[model samples]
Target: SHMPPNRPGITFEIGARLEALDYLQKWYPSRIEKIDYEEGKMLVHFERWSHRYDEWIYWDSNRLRPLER
Candidate 1:
């Protein structure tokens, strides 16, 4: 797997709350169902939405956040 240069040892984790952008590039509530440690990818699902919306997303150049309290 091609990991990012100087990638942090850990940036995301399973079941963590984060905001993910959709195809239209809009932020939505999302949670991590799984993480690809070797590939820096996330299997995310919409927090309160449909199962069909679950997406495997990349970590590089993404707009994810730990959520703003």
Candidate 2:
């Protein structure tokens, strides 16, 4: 599915660029596919390669960010 209205603010949401660290530490530009707030995690579809690759990152992960500190 596309952007869901689970949250419509300035945080984790569908299509939000929450970069993630994939195999071999290659930080991929991933966007939110689906989030699990209850589990403190969310699935991201890596934009580097294609839709075939994705991962589950924790809420507020320390490795990557949306171009921030």
Candidate 3:
């Protein structure tokens, strides 16, 4: 895996909230269920075969790029 240039580490406090739906883009048509943003993390929920699972991705470039997922 490759890292972003000058990517800095971040920390999120518990109970922090973020508006993830506002910054979402189509990654795989209807696969993306919803997004949840925290202090420094973005949670991506996607449709699965059996159950729904979330992918925890770090925030970058003001948006979570699909390449990072």
Candidate 4:
């Protein structure tokens, strides 16, 4: 992996009642299925997780890494 000089960590928190359908309506296809998860999260599985850039994963990018000062 490589690090870029301009990159910095960020944080965010969405409202509790935000549903999976809300996200799917915009980014993912309606055929998507919430296979399983808990109250605040769900696992969506598509027939093939396709993307323009080598199968990109839909995730919270800021939460996936640690911040530095």
Candidate 5:
């Protein structure tokens, strides 16, 4: 996948992490594709049914946060 040149790292807060997970569970067909230590990111492979594309959604380990519900 073509990742952006500058994206923030993933967030490590437990609540935020759970929010991301919850989003995926409710909206996406996804699984942990792999870990890219060099880039400090995790590759989440998911299928976007509407778009008909299977893309690896790269997320920073220090930037994941759950949306306020």
Candidate 6:
């Protein structure tokens, strides 16, 4: 489930899964488990699975703005 293509890219797919598991375990102290993602939306899934503060972030490509502005 942590493989790329099935999940997110190498950076997040490998990194986030490990990070979330640790953080969630710290917060919940033993209620966390495996995390997966929906196809075509790996980035968003990565954020949710990795976030430890329970912060809900809007994940959309459109949200990316040009730095020139």
Identify the leading candidate in terms of TM-score: 1
Each prediction's whole-model lDDT (CA): 0.71, 0.67, 0.36, 0.27, 0.38, 0.28
Model 1 misplaced stretches (Cα beyond 4 Å): 1-11
Query: Scored by Cα lDDT, where does model 5 land?
Result: 0.38
Model 3 per-residue lDDT tens digits across residues 1-69: 232233333223332233222223534211233233434344544433232435555556443332222
TM-score of 5: 0.32
> Each model's number of backbone clashes?
0, 0, 0, 0, 10, 0
Instruction: TM-score each candidate.
Output: 0.71, 0.68, 0.28, 0.19, 0.32, 0.17
As for lDDT, the candidate ahead, 1 or 2, is 1
Which is the better candidate, 2 or 6, if ranked by TM-score? 2
After superposing candidate 3 on the true structure, give the runs of residues whose Cα lies further than 4 Å from its correct spot: 1-39, 47-51, 61-63, 66-69
Model 5 misplaced stretches (Cα beyond 4 Å): 1-27, 47-58, 61-69
Worst 10 residues of 1 by lDDT: 2-11
What tens-digit string does per-residue lDDT give for candidate 1 at 1-69? 654343333246677777888777889888888778687777888888887888888776465655765
The TM-score-based order of candidates, best leading, equals: 1, 2, 5, 3, 4, 6
lDDT of 6 by residue, 1-69 (tens): 224332232233322432222223332212112324443233222234444444222223232221221
lDDT of 5 by residue, 1-69 (tens): 344344343343221222233233444434444555456455443444433333334464322343333
Q: Identify the leading candidate in terms of lDDT.
A: 1
- What is the lDDT, from 0 to 100, of the residue 36 in candidate 6? 40
Please give, for residues 1-69, the per-residue lDDT of candidate 4 as tens digits: 122222233222221112122223433222213312223222333323542212222333221232234
Better of 3 and 6 by TM-score: 3
- State the TM-score for model 6: 0.17
- Candidate 3 Cα deviation (angstroms), residue 43: 1.0
Candidate 3 versus the native: TM-score? 0.28
Question: Which digits, one per residue and each the tens of the lDDT, describe model 2 over residues 1-69?
Answer: 333223223267678775678766877667888888677777878885776677777666655566453
